[PDB]
Design a protein around this ligand. Sequence first.
Ligand SMILES: [Ca+2]
Length: 124
Amino acid sequence: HLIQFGNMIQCTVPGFLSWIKYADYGCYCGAGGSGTPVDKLDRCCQVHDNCYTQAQKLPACSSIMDSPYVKIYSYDCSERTVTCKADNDECAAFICNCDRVAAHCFAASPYNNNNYNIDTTTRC
Ligand SMILES: [Ca+2]
């Protein structure tokens, strides 16, 4: 669930920026995505998008399109590290890993303010 994804971000990069700073960034962090990723962080989002597209195709998710957005999974946070618990079913587990990888990718990427809330219909 997107709400959990938000908490993961709070897990890997504590006390830096609010969730909204990674919700509308570059050509990929935020509704839809197209063009070339403006930077490494944007690149994290591009992969996350694909991951979500893969979840919708994954047989384990029964073709329920909104699965990666609302499906509730089980994860853990400790020492700024996120892990997906084993008590997750196939679909939930895949979605959890999509977010897990993204959260860690964000934390390992520099944040460029000039790429926040940009005009996608010009830079993408
Ligand atoms: Ca997107």
